[PDB]
Every structure is written in C-alpha cells, then in structure tokens.
Amino acid sequence: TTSASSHLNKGIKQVYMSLPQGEKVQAMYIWIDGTGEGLRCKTRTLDSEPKCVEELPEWNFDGSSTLQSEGSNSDMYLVPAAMFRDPFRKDPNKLVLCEVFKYNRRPAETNLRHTCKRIMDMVSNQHPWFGMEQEYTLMGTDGHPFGWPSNGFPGPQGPYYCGVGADRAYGRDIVEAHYRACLYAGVKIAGTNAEVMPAQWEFQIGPCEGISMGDHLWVARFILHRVCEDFGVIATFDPKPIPGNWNGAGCHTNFSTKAMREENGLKYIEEAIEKLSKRHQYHIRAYDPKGGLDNARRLTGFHETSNINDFSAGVANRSASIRIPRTVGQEKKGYFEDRRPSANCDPFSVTEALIRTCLLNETGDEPFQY
Amino acid sequence: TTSASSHLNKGIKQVYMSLPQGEKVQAMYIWIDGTGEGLRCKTRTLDSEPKCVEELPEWNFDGSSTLQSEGSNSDMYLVPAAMFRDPFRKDPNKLVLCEVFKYNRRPAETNLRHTCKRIMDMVSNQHPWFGMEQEYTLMGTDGHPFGWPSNGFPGPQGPYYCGVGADRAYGRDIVEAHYRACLYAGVKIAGTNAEVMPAQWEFQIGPCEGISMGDHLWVARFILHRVCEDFGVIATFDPKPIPGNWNGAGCHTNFSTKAMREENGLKYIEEAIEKLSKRHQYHIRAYDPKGGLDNARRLTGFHETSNINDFSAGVANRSASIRIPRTVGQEKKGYFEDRRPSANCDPFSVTEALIRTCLLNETGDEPFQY
Amino acid sequence: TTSASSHLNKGIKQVYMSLPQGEKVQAMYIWIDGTGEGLRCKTRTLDSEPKCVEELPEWNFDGSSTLQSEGSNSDMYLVPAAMFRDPFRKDPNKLVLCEVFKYNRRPAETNLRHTCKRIMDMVSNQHPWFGMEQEYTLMGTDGHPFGWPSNGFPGPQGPYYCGVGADRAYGRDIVEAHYRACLYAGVKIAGTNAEVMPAQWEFQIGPCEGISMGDHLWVARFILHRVCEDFGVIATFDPKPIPGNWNGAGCHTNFSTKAMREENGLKYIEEAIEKLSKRHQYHIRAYDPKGGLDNARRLTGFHETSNINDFSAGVANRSASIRIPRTVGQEKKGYFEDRRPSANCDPFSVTEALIRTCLLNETGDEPFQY
Amino acid sequence: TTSASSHLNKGIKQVYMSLPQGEKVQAMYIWIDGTGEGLRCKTRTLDSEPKCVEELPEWNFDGSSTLQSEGSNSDMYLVPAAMFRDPFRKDPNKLVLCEVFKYNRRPAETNLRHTCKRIMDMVSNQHPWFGMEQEYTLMGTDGHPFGWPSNGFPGPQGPYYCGVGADRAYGRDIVEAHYRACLYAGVKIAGTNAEVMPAQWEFQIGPCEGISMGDHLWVARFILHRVCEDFGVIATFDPKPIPGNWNGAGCHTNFSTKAMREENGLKYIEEAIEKLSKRHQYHIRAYDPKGGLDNARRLTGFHETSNINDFSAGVANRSASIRIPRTVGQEKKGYFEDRRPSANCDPFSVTEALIRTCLLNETGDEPFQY
Amino acid sequence: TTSASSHLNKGIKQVYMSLPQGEKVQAMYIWIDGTGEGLRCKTRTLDSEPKCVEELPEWNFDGSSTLQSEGSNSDMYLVPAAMFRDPFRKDPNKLVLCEVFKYNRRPAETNLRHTCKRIMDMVSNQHPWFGMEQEYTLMGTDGHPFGWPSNGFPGPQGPYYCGVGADRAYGRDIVEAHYRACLYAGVKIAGTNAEVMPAQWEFQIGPCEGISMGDHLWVARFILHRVCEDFGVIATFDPKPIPGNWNGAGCHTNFSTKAMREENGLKYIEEAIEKLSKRHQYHIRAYDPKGGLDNARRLTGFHETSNINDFSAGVANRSASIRIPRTVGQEKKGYFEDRRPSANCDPFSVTEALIRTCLLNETGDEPFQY
Ligand SMILES: [Mg+2]
Ligand SMILES: [Mg+2]
Ligand SMILES: [Mg+2]
Ligand SMILES: [Mg+2]
Ligand SMILES: [Mg+2]
To answer: Any idea which residues bear N-acetylthreonine here (chains A, B, C, D, E)?
Structure first.
C-alpha cells in the first residue's frame, strides 16, 4: 500500500541531515511540465544565500523529456519568479518557482503566468484579492484510497466530515506535516479540515493579491507532493477519484476588489455576478486542464454540486454556481465565492478568466490581445 | 487491530513538527455534532496569539454534513466559549470549545450549554462544585477490546483492578500520554486508575465550579480521542461494551454547595438527597443521550450497580443510587456522589438537572422556563 | 531486496557514535583496486589531527587479495594524495585518497593518477577546468532496480525525469544524504536531479582545475557507495543496467581553458573540436575500463545517444558526440561538452586524453613519453 | 476467518472413512435444546440396520447441560420421531430426529411437535400442504460475513441477487454440498438461489403434508450446520445479521388445503386470509422464538418487507403480509404465501398457528385445549 | 488476488458431490439481466429427467432485484429456450437458457432473442451460418490482470501470442477446464489459443445455423464464468481492459449463406459486402450494449484494428472492417469475416443486424416492423 522507498530507515537520513552545511546554499527549481498538471524539480548549489529572487541565475532543461518540445532544438529555459524558504532542508536553502520559455525566448504552451501577470498589471489600482480552497484525496500506491479496506469500502458518509478518531480521520499526520511545512516556508495557508469522503482533506490559501495567488497555490501543491512522498503515499487532485455516491473534489475561489470591500459594495458584487452569468461556457472551458471533460464527472447536480450545463447564483446557496455568503449579504459588502473550478485547475487560468470577465468587461469566445 | 495510518513513520512527523513556527498561530475549534455524543474539529490561522477567549472571532460550518440541519439554509455558526493550550502543537497554539447556533441565531438542538449557563448564573452565590469520574474502554479497529485474545476472552475478573504488569494492565501508554497532555493543556484532571475489566480505565475531573465542569470534561474527552487516534486505537464510552459478566462504564458525579461544605452540612446533604428521591425518572431521562435506553444495559442491579427502576441511598453503600462517603458522615459535612449517570452522558445535562432539582426545588416532568 | 545488515537497529549505532572521541583521530585510506572500477578502504588511528595531506604517513596492504599482484612479493604501498573531512564520523576524522605502488616503488597498473599529474603540470599555465555529470542506478540486493515491481517493469518512461511524488521518484533519501555528505566533506558538488529511467539519478561535480577533478569524483563515488551501504542498497555505474527501451548511464564531461573562457574563445573551442574529430577511436578506447566493450551497449544511436562508430559535433545537438551549448555559441566563449564517456569511466584517463589531444597536439595510436 | 479445525488435513479423514464398516451401524440422535433455536447431536452403535423409525430404542441425556432442566433430577429422554439416511457417513448409517420428554414423561418446554402432531391429526382429512423458504447468511469465525472485506463492506446491493462470478457469489461450495447432501438424505429440497445481500443464500423445502414439514426443515438445518462445520464457516439464521441498508432474512411459508387446490379454490383462499387478518398479533407472537422481538429488526416496512404493526394482503404484492401469486389469481386455485415468519422461526409453531387460525376457526389471545 | 471462497477446501466438496443422487434431477435456469451484459442463475428440483426443452416448466423471479422492472408489479417470467448437459453436476442434471417476459407477457427490454428468432425464420431457406471468436481477459479480485506483477507490467508484447511456458501463458488451467466443460455440455466449441496480451485468451464457436449461435455463445460465456468462479478469478469481456499499448478484445464474426458456399459464391459475398458498406453507423450502434461507446476505446485504427469512423474491406486485410480470407478468394466461395463487433456484444443483435442488412435489403436508421 506504501512505496518501497518509504520502508527505508529514516533515522539514517535524519543523522545525515544533522550535519552542518557550511557556506554553500542549495536552491530547488520548480516548474510546470507539459501536461499542465504535474511538477518537476531540480537542485543546484549556490555560492552564497540570495536575498531576493532577482539575484538567482537562469537555468535550462531538456524539454523532450517533459513532453514540452521535440526535434533538434528541445532545450528550454527556467526564469525564477518567486522564492520561498525550504522546509525540507531548512535555512538558508530556498525553493524557487520558475517560468518556462522556448529556445527562441517565447513562453511555453503551459506557461500561463506570462499573460496572467500582464493582465493583473492592468488592474493593479483596484487591488483584487483571491482565496482558494484546495481539496485532495490521499491514495495508496495500489490506486486505492489510503486507509480503505482492501477491495472494499468504509461505512456510509456522514461521520467523516471534520471528524476526530482513529475510525473517522485517515492520514492526519500528512495534514499536520503539510500545514507546518507551509507555515515555515512562508506560504499563506489559512486553515484545514477533513472532508466528507474519508481520506479526503482540504486546505485554504489566502487572501492573496494579484499574481501571488497562483505562486502560493503551486508552491503549496509542491510541498504537499513532497510530504506525501516522504510518507510513502500519493496525493491526487482528480475531481472524482471514486465513482458512485462518494464526494468529488473542488477548488472553490473567493474574489473581491477594493470597491466590493467598501461599504455598499454589494452593488458591485451583483454587477460582477451578472457579468459572469453570460460567460458560463467560457469559464467552464477555462476551469479545467482538459477543457471541461474532467469537471463533467464532478458537476452532475447531485449532492451539494451545481449542474455543469446550467448557471445559477444566490445567497447562502450551496447548490449554486456562485454563492454570496449570508454575512456578506447582511453587511452589504465583502466577497463572493465561485464553486465551479475543479480540484486540478490552474490558478493562473482561473484568476485571469475572472479578471477578464469582471473588471475588463471582455466578451466573446476568445480573449482579447491588447 | 490498529489503524492503517498508525503504521506510518512517526519520526518524519516529529522532524516536521520540530520546525520553528514563526509568528502565525493555529487555533482548533471543537464542537458537539448532532448525535450529542461525537465531536468535530477544525483549524484556522490567526495573525497573533489571543490573550482571552473574547478575542477569538466567530466561524461557521455546513450543518447538513453533521446531521444538525437540512434544506436550503444549512449554515451554522460557532461561538468560542473556552480556551486551552494545545498539547499536540504546543504553545502558542490554542484549543477552542465553541457553541453551535442556527442561521437565525437560535441555539441548536444539541447546544445544551446555553441553558446550563443561565441556570448556573441563577445560583452563582451558592458556589456549587462538581466532580466526575469518566470511565472508558480501549478498543481495536476490529471492534474487539484492545489486548484481548483474538475471538476470545482473558481470564476472569479480579486481578486487573488497579493492576500492574504486562498481563494485568493493557494500554497504559495511552493513559500516561492523556494524563500528561491534560495537565499541559490546563484541564483540571485529578487522577487515574485501571478498572475491573481489562483494557478499561478511568480518570477523574474536578473539583470544578459551575459551568466550567462541562467544558473541562468535553475538552478531556477530545484530548483522549486525539491521543488514541495518534496511537491507532479507539476509545469508546459505551456503558456496556461487552455483554455478560464484564463490568460496564459509568460517569459518577460528586456534588456539593457552600452550605454543605460548612459545619453540619450533612443536614443540607440529606435534604438534597430527599429532594432527589422524588425525581428518579426525570433524572434517568436526563442522564442519557438516548433517554435512558443505553443506561438500561448497565443498571441491572448485579455487580456493584443499582437497579434502574428503583431509587436508593445510603452511607458507604456501593449498590445505591446515591452514596454518602463514610468520611463525610463522620465529619457531618462534605459532598455526596451520584452513581446513576452513564459513561456517554452529557455533563451539561447532568449538572443542569442536579441544580434544578436540588437548589431550585423544581418539580414535575418538564423543566421550568423562567 | 535489502541487505541483512540494514535490518539491524540503527539507534544502537547512533547511541554508540554519540560517545565523545577523546584525543585520538581516525583516518580512512581509500584506493582503487586491480579492476580499475572498485574501491577499497582501511582505517587507522592517529595521535593528533593532521593539518595537511603531507603530514599523513604511508601504509601498505596485501596486493594478492585485490588482484593487483601475485607471487612471493605481493605487498603494496599507499601514498596519501588528497584529504577530506569524514562525513560518517564527523570532525576531526579524515578521508584520505591514496595512490598505489609496487614493492619496487613503481606505479601499479591501475595507478593512472601518476601520469595524469605530470601531464597536467605540463600545461598548468593554461588553467584547464573540468566538469563531469555522474549518472548511476540504485539496485536492490537481488539485482533488480530499487523500487521496481518484482519480476516486472514500471510504466513507460516520461514522467520520471526530474519527477516528484511517491510514484515518480525512487530512493530520494539516498540522494539527499549523499548531497549533504558531499557538501560536508568538502567535495565540489554542483547539483543533482532525477533521470529518465526510474530509480536513476545523477550529480554534477565541478568546476575543478587540473588533477583535482579525478580526486573529487572518486571521493564522491566512495561517499555514494558508503551511503548506499548504510541504507542497504547497491549503487551501480553500469552504462546499460537494463536492456531494452530503458536509458543508459553516461559521464558527460565539460572542458575549457583560459583562452576559451576569454572573449572570442569560440575559435579555440572549434579548433579543439577539430583536433578531437581525428582521434575518435583513441578517445573511445580511453573512455572505458574494458577498452570500449561496455560503452558499446550504450552508444547505439537511439534515444539521446550518438553512435559509437561515428563522430559528430554541433551546437545544441544532444545526439552528437560533442555538444556546444547554445549560450556559448551566442556569447562566442565558454566551454564544450563531451558526451562519449561512459558512467564507469576513470576520470583521470578522460582528463589525460582530453589534455593530450587538445593542448599537446598529440597524434597516433599511442601516448607520447616525454 | 475460518475455524482452526478446518485447517486439519482432510485427506487423512477421507482415508479413514474409506475403511469398510462391517455389521455394526451408527445412528445419530438429534434434538432441539432449551433455547428453542439450537440443535444437539449424539451417536450410538446398533447391532443391525433399522428399517423403520419404530425399531430404534429410546435414549437419554443430561438436561442441566442444555438449559432444559435443573435440580436433583435433570435427566431427559429422547424418543425417535423421524429417520433419514446419513450423508456424512453414508449407508447403512442413519440420522434420527427425536422428541424430548422430562423425567416424568411430560413434554419439554421446547417440545412443540407434541401438540402440533395432535392438531394436524385433527384435520388430516383436509390434506394441508406446506412449503417454506429458508434464508441464511454465511459468517466467518470472527463475526463478519464470509468473503466481505476485512472491517469493511462490499459494493452496494443489486448485482448479487442470483449472481454468478467470483465477485458476485460467495461460498457456493457450501450451497452445492448442502443441496447434494439433502437430496441424498431424503429431505424434500426444492431449489436454491443467491439472495440480495452478498453471502446470503436460500433454499426451499416442500411441498410437505402435515407434520413432516417441521421434520424436514429441522433436518435440513442440521445438515447445513454440519456442512458449514466441515468447511469451517458459520451459518446464522438471524433475521437481521447486518444493521443498515442490507437485507434481512425471512422464512416465507406457503399454505393450501384440498379445497383450495380444486377449481374455484380462490374463494377458500380469500376466506382463510380474511380469518388471518384478525389475529395479526397472535401470529406475530407465534412466528418468533423470542415472542416477536427478533422480527422487529426485520419487519420495518422498508425494502421488500411489511410493517410489523400492520396487516395487509394483496395479489402479487411483495410489500404485504400475505401475498397471492398472480398465477393463482388467474387460475382461481392454488395457495397463498405468508411473508411474516422470521428466519429463525420454529416450523412447528408456524404450522400449528396457521392450522388453528384457518381450519379450526380459533379466536382469542390463547390456544384452545380440546 | 484470488477470492476468499477459493481458499476453502475442495476435497470436501468433491467428497460431497461423489454421493449418488437418486431419482430427482437438478435444473439450472439462466437468463440475461437488465444491463444486457450479465447473467443470472437459479436452480430447482425436477421429479424426473427431461428429454426435450418442451417438457420444462415456466418459472419467475423478482425483476426489481435485477434492474429489469420497478413498481407494484415487478415479477418477471422465465420461458425455457435451450437445454444442455450440466458439466458442474454431470448427468442427468441440465442447464436451461431462458427468455424473460414482463408481467403482461411482453418481452423484456433486454430480450433480443424474441425478434431475432422471427427474423431468422423469415430467411430459413437460405441456411445462414455463423461463427464467433470470443476474446477475454483473466483478472484477479483486485482489478489487475491475473499473473501480472503487483502494481506493474510484464515484458513487452510479442512472446505471448500462442505461447507455451510458465513465463508466456497465464491461467491455462482455466482454459483447459472450460474447453472440456464446453465439450461435455454440448456447446459447439471449435478451438482456443492464447492472445497477444498476456493473460488474454480466445475460443471459437461455430459453425452454428440461425438462432442457435446466440444460445451457444451465451451458454459458453456462462460456463466460463462458472469455471473462473471455481478457480477464484474473474473473466472480463471489456473491449479495452488495460489502456495504452496493450491489445483490446474483439468478437470477430463469420457469415455465409447457401449461395455463398456454392461455386462462384464470391459474387454474392461481394454483393453482401457492398450492402454492408452503406450501414456502418447502424452496425456500429448494433455491435455494442452501450450503443458504440465501449467499442470506441478499441477501434482506434492502431494495432490490428480499424477506425470506428471509417468503413473498409479487402482480401487478407487485418486492418479492414471486413476481411475476405485469401483461401476464399482463391476458391471463389466460402465466407467473410466481420471484425467490428466488440468483445461484450450481444450475439443476437449482431446476427439480426447482419441478416437484416444482407438478406432482407433493409435501409435507413431504424429496423422494419413487418
Ligand atoms: Mg470544503
Ligand atoms: Mg471507578
Ligand atoms: Mg543527464
Ligand atoms: Mg427470498
Ligand atoms: Mg484473435
């Protein structure tokens, strides 16, 4: 059920990691591969500790091995974008999130941060804030959810949501380790809780301003993957890992601007929702790496989910595409929540689509070029 | 016999937890679900360490997932009530016990603290003190008591009560960890001992004044559940886990007021016992989440238990519904013990019933409204 | 799958190693055996900590037991050459790399450092720099790659290159321990990454000047072997451990001189490549302990490999024998990479061949004597 | 999951059973113990093979060991009632079903055949026929249904009813062996099928005339118990072995007389149903060894069950207390089915109650004495 | 990997089944459930051995448990259609294939034999013959192909087609037992062979005239399911059990009439192929229980498969929709092969579609009514 490498003696590794480092510094480069969902990592040595991301040098990798290029010139380039403290090796080591460029210096197909940053720069004065709730499921190496009976199912749902106990919460050690690691690294993690389906968990990232939302979410995903690798289990972001009566995984997003946060911002909130109501198909396309095929299995209308083909909104409505918190309605200001995005969505795409539809008043089936 | 998540490497978790936290603080919210017996937990990040429970903000959760609401408006609200140090994450993190309210700000069905607080406030000048002895049994994940032979039984009772040795005490590590964690968290734990049935233990909480007794007992139960989850076993509060000659689990309660603690308080103790003798059915109803069905399996009159259908009292009588300690009788003052409450009772209900019957002189089959 | 000695309790060993050492110092002597691939080690006690390699004494060993001599006089002598901090015993203990000599003080057959040092001394003023990328595969004690299914294969290649996750990276603990140990010991390790074939990794050593490259690479190999022994697995440098579609292991080498590193050094780089193009067979002979038989299984022309029988070169060409980085071509200066050397090559031989062909303008089928 | 004795080598047992017997004959006496649910067996040697049940001698046993007597005179007596061929030892050995009498020759409290025989004799000229469908569940020695995931559940119901395949039918070998053994012994077994709940099966007995129905059903139950003992599993007749959404077990009974079977017997069927409609509580009391408490867990009104508190009848109605098959309604003659009896019912009690209510026109809350 | 019930002792079952039966006879009724893919079975006792299928009585079952009806009248009826010898219980026991009818005697939705029989009767004078090659895969109870490495893959395809040896053929015991059982029962089995993908096999049925083809194929499928259940494995007819480079499963069908079999029948074969070329979508719809979705995963145009979207035909072409054997072309008479049908097809649907298109000259998107 667990990987072979997880059965090695970890005391030896701790003893080795207790050695003083010296004066060299390790930096780990992270980037998104050609599938648009996976991550790749790489390590290099630095003479001294960098103080800002601008001080890190550029690097490169073979694109033909990551399904990002082919032919005689498959080399690609990594440009640092964000820097965080390394929780697996501690200070002064660093984690670096990088953008991918082709040999001719054009952004790669899956490099969606390049356009998102430019779009965000156009509405900086409005100070858009974001918050996302990432749900995921822990799986064993055999493809079965962690802690489930062999070739079987646990009891019916109901006792696992926010549950406590050896028979209600599965793999809380991973959750605690991930929370502490994210706090140490500097990620803006807001909370966690156990979900309805056993072995399914959730963590919230935010509030984040502008482009930092995607950086924080991607770094959190990478940290979760590394922690699960340490424990020997697999973390999956599939929107519907188990068919049937079991719950799916979503990536609900909170959105607000300076106008909405101010008293009587409910008018702007309703204006934004009205604008969003006319681009349901476009947003559904932008909320899935596969263009919407994956989210179809999740958004069926059953359980507390909204149908994929229909748009709806309301106040304190958990079955609607867009939900307005009751507190926001009472205090006529705040934010609104979008419940459509899938668990394996790309935050850059979601934020860019929201900004384009709500603030830039874009219309049609394609994005503007500016 | 043990949960799958208990077989993960705990050294890795310790290494992760050794990381310095920084400046953010974690707070865990705890509340009672719709069954009136289980507990639910949730974590969020705070900007700075709170100094008093009044500084914590409110929160909310989906009531339809905890069998506490249904329909279009299932949102519920959590209001902090008590704060304790977190023993699983250490300082400056906190544990928070919260009350549950409906979307219209009315207390939920299982929110019994709301009325208990007012009832206690009505008689604050008398300074009522409480003390409860919680008994529980450790179980494996297969439903069999921890340490018992597979599909079998241990030797007859007699050597296990307060026993020491590998063949007499089962799971003392859980007991020691729970004791130390409760002491660290600030819970008013008074002692522990092994019980007659193997794998059955007990801990005493008190003396506590007024409403604090329920808070302390609930927090102790939550800590026990978390510790057992860490070790991979299950702690059950069922009054009669194993049918037959094996002992049940009770929640004996001690009660006294300022008058009873002074000289010649035995007169007031006897008056209170006489008052209690006329509301046996009411108290039996109030001493069980199921209205008394569960306690029927325990209170059969055999062993050192009193019959459910008959009320009795005496001095140094272990088979009576109410017992007066011999020392109290000799010194004409002190307290008296109620042996009726079941292991899975709700402390708020028990304390409220005792206060209503003994101090407010209430009568009838229903509580007063005031 | 793991060695028996790896199942011993390592906590006991750590407890023993925690004892204070005192005033004596341990020194470990390392030398290359008669096969030209393996390493041998030996420990002795010293009165005080040596400050430089010149202070260490000479030693000896029985050559008949290492396939390095035979007959009546099989004794051999060890002469210290380089000193490093000991990462397995920490300071003040040391690691010592030694040369092997016969009973008559003539260098042994596998002692290639003797000639390499003189050759490097002949061209010291030009300041040649080197950099090598060592690839290796982790194997179980049963001869199967670590983490692979029993008598089976993992999924097709593509997700493992620079992968993260319990199902994409095998044995990262060994890699982390080796990296930290190399950093502590003073080896000039530059980076690491996961390779295309699962359970295959690599690390980069450099830049190193002159003879130090071989010392650093050999010490890194020894440290890797010791770490893998601690974890209970085997590290193999075979160029083609698994036949079929799975990738082989190489030892790509970077080379540059003072002239090449200055402005318009591309001219000298091209001249060196032109010189190299005429000694393909000689270099292939010098790049393999077996004379080229082992490298035949790797250099087949398929995948990202060049054919053994044909020489080629180009800019940003990963299928050529010699590759010129695109950045170097753009900035008309830098270094060039040789992709022919096998994983189990001897760094001294490779560096000596490169120096002889490029700087000394040697020709013919045999090396010059001077 | 299986018995320890089931792990003994069975080839040895077969070799021993291959020995020729000789002249002596083995007879196994079977009787119902004091719980009214279990069976007890006992073997003795006979000089020659008996041809009729009248040739067998009487026997006795200690009643204090079977909860059927106590005190100074606890000896009970066995009187043979029916004889069958022995399928476990083959011819000429026999199985004998016996009645239990007290030391003073009065029938035992659990001996219901004594009165049932007289009641049947009173109405012999009407030729009442009976048929019963016995449902049961196969369980492991650990208390979990055979073949279910450990501490878990299989998939939802729907594919297991009359299913075929390794993932749809559990323990078919027991069913096949029991069928063949019943056919060999002479029991009037009519068919079998897999039931809705996995590991749940069913077999039909009949048509049987008068008192032979109970004898045949009891012998079939004993044979099933012996076969399951041979295989190492447990057969349980509990009406609701698994709480929740899983189906219970019933003992539906068929009934008809000579008048009903003739042309236009539907009139008599309707008269009998009308009579039965006024003794629902009496029949519920008679259909359960515990007086109706066990059947309460099954007859909840959900699934294909009727409510215990209400009586209903109809044609081709599977949710009613009494069902008239559609073919019977079309042809105006045949039988009707009673779906109330529990799986662990006593056939003698059921048949006696049906005869008393339908043919003898008895009324009131107690049986007549005659 | 294998079922729990497969671990029960089988010598006990053989001993029980060695008992002489007697006069009564067992008959097993078989029918197709509401999914159109699965089978259900049921056993009853008969007084004497039936000689022809006309002597067997009708039966019934609850349709609400097989997804074939719902509501107040869910009772269905079984009408015997074909009879075979029982290989699991031997003579004189029988297997009975039955048709399903609703409570009003209308055929069920999945009862396709009713219309197929009439269609065959309309063209009886032309003597159509059929033959099918059923492919299947053996799976363990964990969902992985039988004999494959745990969480892994075997070597690449190429040595498994018609292979012999412990490392090339998996589960040949099931194949041998199924062959012998089919021969005993009277099924017209023509041969078997191991397929390209390891653990994949195939058997051929035919030549069969008219309606008997479907009966024979269904009985063979049932026998295979029972044998696999005996061995504890699962046989799956999924057209693409393993995604990727592994071969799918098909049900290639042969077809010919009296005119085609005569001299110069190639003209009629070509006419039939020309007719078939214009109803590709109709036949694709008729060749899959799901209307063509399952076959989409198989007919991708790669390997020895044709594209689902295109129709093609040729002589000795394995990549075409229709193949004319080279021997048939040389001899100018014989048959042609249709390679489109899926492995989980319904033979009645396939044969009916072929007859309607080729002999009745039907056109359009719907079948005629006659
Ligand atoms: Mg959530
Ligand atoms: Mg006690
Ligand atoms: Mg490489
Ligand atoms: Mg039934
Ligand atoms: Mg084939």
So the answer is: 1
Domains contained in chain E, number: 2
The answer to whether A4 contacts C165, with C-beta atoms less than 8 Å apart, is: no
Q: How many CB atoms lie within 10 A of CB D147?
A: 20
Residue pair B171/B156 in contact by the 8 Å Cβ criterion: no
**Helices and strands, counts by H and E, chain E:** 10, 13
Which regions of chain C does DSSP assign to beta strands (E)? 25-32, 39-46, 59-62, 75-85, 94-101, 129-139, 189-194, 200-209, 234-236, 253-256, 313-315, 322-324, 336-338
Verify that B288 and B347 share a domain, yes or no.
Answer: yes
Picking from C153, C244, C245, the nearest residue to E152 by CB comes out as C153
Write out the binding residues of C for ATP. 133, 202-207, 254-256, 318, 323
Token pair listed for E152: 């892994």
- Domain residues for D71? 2-109
Distance CA B114, CA C231 (A): 59
CA distance C69 to chain A (A): 38
Query: Closest Cα of chain B to D176: distance in Å?
Result: 29
Best C153, C168, C246 member to test E by mutation, with max E CBs in 10 Å, is C153
* Ligand having the closest approach to the CA of C304: 3
Q: Which amino acid is at E237?
A: F
Taking CA D84 as the corner, what is the angle to CA D90 and CA D171, rounded to the nearest 5 degrees? 65
Q: What is the identity of the amino acid at E366?
A: E
Kindly identify which residue of chain D lies nearest to residue A167, measuring between CA atoms: D151
Residues A250 and A329 in one domain: yes
Instruction: Tell which of C148, C151, C157, C246 to mutate to test the E interface (max E CBs under 10 Å).
Output: C151
| Other CB atoms within 10 Å distance of the CB of residue E319 | 15
Kindly state the DSSP code that residue E246 receives in the 8-state scheme. Answer: S
* DSSP string computed for A63-124: GGGTTS--SS--EEEEEEEEEEE-TTT-TT-EEEEEEEE-TTSPBPTT--HHHHHHHHHTTG
Whether residue C58 sits in one domain with residue C184: no
Nearest to D166 among E10, E15, E229 (CB): E229
Angstrom distance (rounded) from CA B269 to CA B259: 9
Q: Looking at A88, A109, A130, which one is the last position of a domain?
A: A109
In angstroms, the Cα distances linking E258 to B296, E129, E262, E334 are 83, 9, 6, 9
Contact yes or no, B with A (3+ CB pairs under 8 Å): yes
Q: To the nearest whole angstrom, how far is the Cα of E319 from the nearest Cα of chain D? A: 34
Same domain, B86 and B179: no
For A12, A146, B184, D90, D243, the CA distances from B13, given in Å and listed in that order, are 15, 17, 21, 64, 38
State the number of CA atoms in the 13 A half-sphere of E300 facing the CB. Answer: 14
Resolution in A: 2.3
Are both D93 and D118 inside the same structural domain? no
Domain end (from E82, E109, E136):
E109
Q: What is the Cα B358 distance to its own chain's centre? A: 22
A114 contacts A99 by C-beta, under 8 angstroms: yes
DSSP string, C50-66: -SSGGGSPPEEEEGGGT
Structure-solving method: cryo-EM
Pick from D304, D296, D302, D289: which is nearest to D195 by CA?
D304
Q: Quote the tokens at residue B196.
A: 């007659």
Residues of C whose CB is below 8 A from E153: 149, 152-155
C105 and C159 in a single domain? The answer is: no
Residue type, B157: Q
User: How far away is chain D from the Cα of A155, in angstroms, using its nearest Cα?
Assistant: 7
- Residues A225, A298: contact at Cβ < 8 Å? no
Chain length of chain E? 370
CB-nearest partner of C150 from E150, E156, E244: E150
Specify whether D176 is located in the same domain as D56.
no
| D74 lies in the same domain as D138 | no
